[PDB]
């Protein structure tokens, strides 16, 4: 699609909603309550908090906002049914009324891993809708998002250029004596000043796989510093990670870096259309074992990227394999090699094309 407004033409989101409603019909689901932010953005075209969206299998959807907010939300979204409330009580009562008016018998809810997929709404809904069967629809919503359209890809391309600007800042400022938090602060600002509305920055000077920065951990001489960025454009993310060597690396760091380099070459060469992800995992594990790094292997070399930094295909808490498919957007390699000196990481966002992987970051 060409000549899209700065946030996408409203037709994009109408079509996604229509395809979502057909998917509900195919599974005999009468309606869906969408309370995850990422799927709310996917279907309405805008970020709004808290995300509260009711989608009947047939008919017009409804969005619930706080009194006073309808005018800006309607300026941003194609959705016309907007209900304002003054108390969170009225919201559940509003959902209950649309449940009754539509005669729904099976209602979808996303058992997801993001705001606002929390436990209390699910429990209250069951008590207040006793005749209704709640069905998890995360397979549906993530199923639609796994293959990107051309506008989504263009958004991720822009986010990847922003990630690069943030990583350039990181490389320029990292030096002995800075704290993880001071480094993250400058990266964050640079990302936000280039238009990212919800960036996430990790900076580690110790081995941590999810390294939100600390104020009192400082860069040392002859060390490594690992920076991870997930940053957005039009709410679509790009993910990238770099390991910086400060001064002279010791023998264990150099060996771990050489192994990570060779593992990346394997992952990129073997990730192609039609390959099951676990086929590549097996190869990466076997490679770590041949090099005396069997105990250092972590599963999950890649994940999808989109309206979430991490989205399927990804490791979760096993039925059928997931095969690489064209127009997936994948982050490679996501896992660190953990040594006492730090989390050795080199990560980029790639578009899966028919015959190759195109690096976007």
- Looking at residues 282 to 341 of the shown chain, list those that interact with Mn ion (rule: CB under 5 A): 331, 334
Q: Are 325 and 313 in contact (CB under 8 A)?
A: no
Q: Which does 127 bind (CB under 5 to 8 A by kind): Na ion, Mn ion, a second copy, none?
A: none
The only residue of 166, 213, 304, 306 in contact with a second copy, by rule CB under 8 A: 213
Residue 332 CB, shortest distance to Mn ion, in Å, is 9
The only residue of 94, 164, 165, 212 in contact with a second copy, by rule CB under 8 A: 212
Residue 260 CB, shortest distance to a second copy, in Å, is 14
- Cα separation, 250 vs 75, in Å, equals 57
Residue partners of 118: CB distance under 8 A and separation at least 6: none
Q: For residue 226, state whether it binds Mn ion (rule: CB under 5 A).
A: no
Token duo for residue 115: 């705001």
Nearer to Na ion, 130 or 340 (CB): 340
Nearer to a second copy, 130 or 317 (CB): 317
The only residue of 61, 108, 112, 304 in contact with a second copy, by rule CB under 8 A: 112
x/- string (CB under 8 A) for a second copy, residues 299-338?
A: xx--------------xxxx-----------------x-x
Q: In a 3-state reduction of DSSP, which class is residue 320?
A: coil
Q: What does the DSSP 8-state code read for residue 296?
A: G
Q: For residue 297, state whether it binds a second copy (rule: CB under 8 A).
A: yes
Residue 356 CB, shortest distance to a second copy, in Å, is 29
Residues in contact with Na ion, counted by CB under 5 A, come to a total of 1
Q: For residue 74, state whether it binds Na ion (rule: CB under 5 A).
A: yes
Q: Which helix (H) or strand (E) holds 332?
A: strand 329-332
Q: Which does 230 bind (CB under 5 to 8 A by kind): Na ion, a second copy, Mn ion, none?
A: none
Could you count the other beta carbons within 10 Å of the beta carbon of residue 52?
24
**Strand partners for 167:** none
- Cα separation, 243 vs 249, in Å, equals 12
Nearer to Na ion, 89 or 216 (CB): 216
Q: Among 350, 349, 345, which residue's Cα sits nearest to residue 272?
A: 350
Longest dimension (CA), the chain: 69
Nearer to Na ion, 76 or 161 (CB): 76
Residue 91 CB, shortest distance to a second copy, in Å, is 7
Q: Are 151 and 1 in contact (CB under 8 A)?
A: yes
Nearer to a second copy, 295 or 355 (CB): 295
Residue partners of 289: CB distance under 8 A and separation at least 6: 297
Token duo for residue 147: 């293959």
Tally the C-alpha atoms within 13 A of residue 336's C-alpha that lie toward its C-beta: 25
Q: Are 274 and 323 in contact (CB under 8 A)?
A: yes
x/- string (CB under 5 A) for Mn ion, residues 162-201?
A: ----------------------------------------
Torsion of CA 298, 138, 40, 235, to 10 degrees: 20
Q: Which does 74 bind (CB under 5 to 8 A by kind): Mn ion, a second copy, Na ion, none?
A: Na ion
Q: For residue 323, state whether it binds Na ion (rule: CB under 5 A).
A: no
**What is the β-pairing status of strands 106-109 and 133-136?**
parallel
Q: For residue 156, state whether it binds a second copy (rule: CB under 8 A).
A: no
Nearer to a second copy, 6 or 131 (CB): 6
Positions touching Mn ion (CB under 5 A) are 239, 331, 334
Positions touching Na ion (CB under 5 A) are 74
């Amino acid at each position: 699609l060409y000549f899209q407004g700065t946030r996408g033409n409203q037709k994009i989101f109408r079509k996604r909603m229509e395809r979502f409603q057909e998917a509900l019909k195919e599974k005999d689901i009468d309606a869906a309550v969408i309370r995850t932010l990422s799927t709310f953005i996917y279907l309405t075209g805008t970020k709004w908090l808290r995300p509260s969206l009711f989608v009947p299998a047939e008919g017009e959807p409804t969005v619930f906002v706080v009194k006073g907010e309808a005018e800006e939300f309607k300026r941003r979204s194609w959705i016309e049914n907007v209900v304002e409330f003054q108390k969170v009580e009225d919201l559940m009562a509003g959902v209950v009324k649309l449940i009754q008016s539509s005669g729904a018998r099976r209602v979808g809810l996303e058992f997801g891993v993001e705001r606002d997929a929390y436990l209390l709404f699910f429990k209250m809904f069951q008590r207040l809708n006793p005749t209704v069967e709640v069905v998890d629809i995360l397979d549906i919503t993530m199923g639609m998002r796994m293959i990107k359209d051309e506008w989504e890809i263009e958004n991720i391309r822009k986010a990847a250029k922003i990630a690069n600007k943030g990583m350039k800042v990181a490389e320029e400022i990292i030096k002995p004596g800075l704290s993880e938090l001071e480094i993250a602060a400058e990266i964050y600002r640079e990302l936000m000043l280039n238009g990212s509305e919800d960036p996430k920055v990790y900076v580690s000077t110790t081995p941590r796989a999810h390294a939100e920065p600390f104020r009192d951990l400082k860069v040392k001489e002859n060390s490594v510093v690992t920076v991870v960025i997930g940053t957005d454009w039009n709410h679509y993310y790009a993910n990238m990670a770099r390991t910086f060597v400060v001064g002279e690396p010791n023998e264990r760091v150099k060996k771990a870096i050489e192994v990570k380099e060779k593992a990346l070459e394997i992952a990129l060469e073997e990730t192609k259309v039609g390959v099951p992800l676990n086929s590549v995992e097996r190869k990466l594990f076997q490679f770590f074992k041949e090099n005396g790094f069997e105990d250092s292997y972590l599963a999950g070399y890649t994940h999808g990227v989109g309206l979430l930094i991490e989205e399927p295909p990804m490791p979760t808490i096993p039925t059928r394999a997931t095969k690489v498919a064209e127009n997936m957007v994948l982050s490679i390699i996501h896992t660190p090699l953990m040594i006492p000196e730090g989390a050795i990481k080199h990560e980029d966002t790639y578009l899966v094309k028919k015959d190759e992987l195109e690096k976007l970051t």
